[PDB]
Write a protein that binds this ligand. Structure first.
Ligand SMILES: [Cl-]
Ligand SMILES: [Mg+2]
Length: 223
């Protein structure tokens, strides 16, 4: 890993344990609108923009595109369900891994589709001295969500990085696809209920069952 300069962290399900909340919120919001999106299906659709997930459900069952008004209202309803849960806490091992990454001289980057205000300071409270404004990719930076490679390509651009100078930590099949399509070595961390084979089919180079285990095996990963 002599060429390696940076580690590109997905947020949801990698830094913070937010996916029990996201997947239930999505299942429940659709169920209220007479629509069938299961929790496992929500997990399969992790990393998509709200506009993407809603369109998929709408085209499949109703035979229609979702309008912009219908997107914002369903996304806001889903946001209310999500926000009624106690704020997600840290993925065990993430802070320890970040410590190792930084001590190695590698640059910690964060990539997410979230449009949260006050994200940096939340990241600063939870992982002191790790992340920086100029080295963040969020919803305001990119148009598309996973499996589009654009967020990770933006992350390389902002870091001044080639594809071979970075690694992606992902937890989600569509996110893993985005990292692999961006030409970046992609490590999968299986923090949900899906089969590890689903992350492998998506293009994951390595596969670990938790963020702690990746941290423990970090100095035995070679590039
Ligand atoms: Cl999150
Ligand atoms: Mg994720």
């Amino acid at each position: 890993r002599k060429k390696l300069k940076a580690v590109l962290f997905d947020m949801a399900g990698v830094l913070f344990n937010s996916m029990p909340y996201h997947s239930e919120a999505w299942h429940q919001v659709m169920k209220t609108h007479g629509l069938d999106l299961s929790r496992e299906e929500a997990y399969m659709h992790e990393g998509r923009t709200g506009a993407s997930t809603i369109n998929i459900v709408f085209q499949r069952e109703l035979g229609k595109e979702a309008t912009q008004e219908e997107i914002e209202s369903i996304y806001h309803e889903k946001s209310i369900l999500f926000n009624s849960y106690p704020e997600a806490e840290r993925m065990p091992g993430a802070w320890e891994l970040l410590q190792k990454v930084k001590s190695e001289g590698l640059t910690p980057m964060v990539v997410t589709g979230s449009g949260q205000l006050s994200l940096l300071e939340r990241l600063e409270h939870n992982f002191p001295g790790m992340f920086h404004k100029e080295l963040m990719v969020t919803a305001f930076d990119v148009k598309y969500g996973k499996p589009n490679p654009e967020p990770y390509l933006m992350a390389l651009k902002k870091g001044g990085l080639k594809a071979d100078e970075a690694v992606v930590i992902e937890n989600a099949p569509l996110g893993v696809e985005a990292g692999h399509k961006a030409g970046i070595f992609t490590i999968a961390v299986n923090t949900g209920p899906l089969d590890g084979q689903v992350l492998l089919d998506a293009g994951a180079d390595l596969l670990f069952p938790s963020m702690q285990t990746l941290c423990d095996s970090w100095d035995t990963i070679m590039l």
